[PDB]
Amino acid sequence: GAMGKTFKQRRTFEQRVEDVRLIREQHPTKIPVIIERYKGEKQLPVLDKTKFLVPDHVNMSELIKIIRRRLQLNANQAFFLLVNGHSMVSVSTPISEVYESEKDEDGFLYMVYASQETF
């Protein structure tokens, strides 16, 4: 019997804090953010990976386009990104301030995406 174990299942809480801090040490110029497909996202495809490294000098317009590039998102269809599970950030806000405004207790950043403006 199959079992699709997400990143948090294959990496215990200890391994998670250790991974985040080690990432902050080796890649101090990158922010560890989780990009997960919404549980009801049926139209849009699943992201190839979940752990991303974004430079603090960028904005969401760019991050959105990077995901659109590899996910090969359609032009006739649109989507939104919810931070920690809430869509309240503007596309022009720098990820540096967004990171410290949404930082989790383990120090990781969570993000979920879907093709809908309201859940």
Partner: peptide, 17 residues
């Protein structure tokens, strides 16, 4: 989970430095 190495776990953003 005996064997374990630094697999591709994180995916950095594409930019121009």
């Amino acid at each position: 989970n005996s064997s374990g190495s630094s697999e591709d776990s994180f995916v950095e953003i594409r930019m121009a430095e």
